[PDB]
């Protein structure tokens, strides 16, 4: 029921915080460098460090700008914080295989 950084165990999110964006919490997407990600949407996350300023370029979610989200402890890329949108204004898209699920 909680998600930790797979690399270092930093607390990041919770199963209760999964958000079905466009009907599903899971989106399979690729970036311009052709990397494929299995992204899980969460309402809320913690223990991250957001780097840079938001960008609308190549956004996988209509009306949202993204900032890269690193693990605040180990600096591992865990996904993106999304903002600037509507219903909801903000959320997190985290890469499923970079998280470890386990007991609270």
């Amino acid at each position: 029921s909680i998600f930790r950084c797979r690399q270092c165990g930093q607390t990041i999110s919770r199963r209760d915080w999964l958000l079905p964006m466009g009907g599903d919490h899971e989106h399979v997407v690729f970036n311009p460098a052709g990397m494929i990600f299995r992204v899980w949407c969460f309402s809320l996350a913690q223990g991250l460090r957001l780097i840079g300023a938001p960008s609308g370029e190549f956004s996988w979610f209509k009306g949202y700008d993204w900032t890269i989200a690193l693990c605040g402890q180990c600096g591992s890329h865990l996904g993106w914080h999304y903002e600037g949108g509507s219903q909801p204004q903000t959320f997190f898209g985290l890469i499923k295989d970079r998280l470890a699920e386990g007991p609270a």
Partner: peptide, 7 residues
């Protein structure tokens, strides 16, 4: 590295 982290 930044290219691989872009959404």
């Amino acid at each position: 590295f930044f290219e691989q982290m872009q959404n």
